[PDB]
């Protein structure tokens, strides 16, 4: 049908209700704005008014009022040069000119005084608007490591060997040193006959030689993507998949010739699985 639909008519009436409310706010700024009254003016519940305004305006009432006040102060900066900046900052509801300057630099992109000097209003009109992954330069670390080649489960057993070595040789990766796991392969995709996992601990000097199989090696430094994973060692492969799916296409950076490696800032069983902290590191060239 080409005709007007009852559904669209209702949505239009609702939107224009809330537009009436917006205009009332624009008029009655700098006033005690009782949410009960504004909620009544929208023919809606006081308990749901904020979510509706956030839904449609795109920003809550406190951000909206703040940013309208900031735009008013911007007009006053550019076109009322006689007014003092402290006075303007007080008029916009800010206690200190420093905090007003903070908010201006945060939302606008220019400092207040530079705006008073050369307003770039075009930018202002264009500036109306999950997991943190970072880029760090990992320093090359001499470590002592044991390589496991076999079934992915037996890895735990081999890890025990390393722990035993730490008690026996007096080498202390426990303190003033770090403990990493070089994850060469993904156990599901990779044949468990070739699965390689390196359990390593940081050392300040070489560890001589030992019959257990622990040997000296190094983790090279340079560009490297870091993602903070919170929880189980069984949960790490999914965040590794996250890194590969999301960071590699978007970043456009190229990985270098070293396997993925995790640094356990919180060791396994000393704290709970729910509070365990691991850092996944993707080598980047």
Swiss-Prot record:
Highest taxon in the source lineage: Bacteria
Pfam families: GyrI-like, HTH_18
Keywords, alphabetical: DNA-binding, Transcription, Transcription regulation
Region named Putative effector binding domain: 116-285
SUPFAM superfamilies: Homeodomain-like, Probable bacterial effector-binding domain
InterPro entries: AraC_E-bd, DNA_gyrase_inhibitor, GyrI-like, Homeodomain-like_sf, HTH_AraC, HTH_AraC-typ_CS, Reg_factor_effector_dom_sf, Tscrpt_reg_AraC-type_HTH
Biological process, per Gene Ontology: cellular response to antibiotic
Annotated HTH araC/xylS-type domain residues: 19-118
DNA-binding region(s), chain positions: 36-57, 85-108
GO molecular function annotations of the record: DNA-binding transcription factor activity; peptide binding; sequence-specific DNA binding
Additional note from the record: Duplication of the STM3175 gene increases tolerance of albicidin.
Task of the protein: Probable transcription factor.
Record remark: domains: Binds the peptide antibiotic albicidin with sub-micromolar affinity.
Assembly notes: Homodimer.
Name of protein: Probable HTH-type transcriptional regulator STM3175
Organism: Salmonella typhimurium (strain LT2 / SGSC1412 / ATCC 700720)
High-level lineage: Bacteria, Pseudomonadati, Pseudomonadota, Gammaproteobacteria, Enterobacterales
